[PDB]
Amino acid sequence: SMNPPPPETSNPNKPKRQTNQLQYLLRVVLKTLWKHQFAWPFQQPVDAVKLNLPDYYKIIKTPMDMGTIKKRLENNYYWNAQECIQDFNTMFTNCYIYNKPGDDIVLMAEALEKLFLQKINELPTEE
């Protein structure tokens, strides 16, 4: 087995928009989560080859990671905040689906999710 290409992060055929909510997601949410002590396994796509997890992409058909989210944000890939929030949620869910509950990697994801939700709660009104 081999890794799939990473998720698309740039699409010239896809309308671009810059909003205060998207800006917050990049300059606050992404930035805060990236620097968290538990962030590192989520900073790039799961390398199933390097990690010897040959069944990862047999199970996870919608991979997502914060490296991809960073690229989508800085490329203005998203039209709205919900698209980005969905990517974060997918990342967390993938971890919970693939890994046994209570495993270290799951506990790390759970804490990151708690912080994510805390920052999402303070999402500024679309002005």
Ligand X SMILES: Oc1cccc(-c2[nH]c(-c3ccccc3)nc2-c2ccncc2)c1
The footprint of ligand X (CB under 6 A) covers 37-38, 40-41, 46, 51, 95, 98-99, 104-105, 107-108
21 vs 70 by CB, closer to ligand X: 70
Owner of token pair 């992404």: 30
The three-state secondary structure class of 56 is: helix
User: In the numeric block, which tokens belong to residue 18?
Assistant: 């810059």
Pick the closest to residue 93 from 123, 63, 116 (CA basis): 63
CB of 57 to ligand X, least distance (A): 11
CB of 101 to ligand X, least distance (A): 12
98-119 core/surface letters (b: 16 or more CB in 10 A; e: else): bbeeeeeebebbeebbeebeeb
CB of 29 to ligand X, least distance (A): 19
CB of 17 to ligand X, least distance (A): 30
105 vs 120 by CB, closer to ligand X: 105
60 vs 81 by CB, closer to ligand X: 60
51 vs 117 by CB, closer to ligand X: 51
CA distance 95 to 76: 26
User: In the numeric block, which tokens belong to residue 79?
Assistant: 């039209």
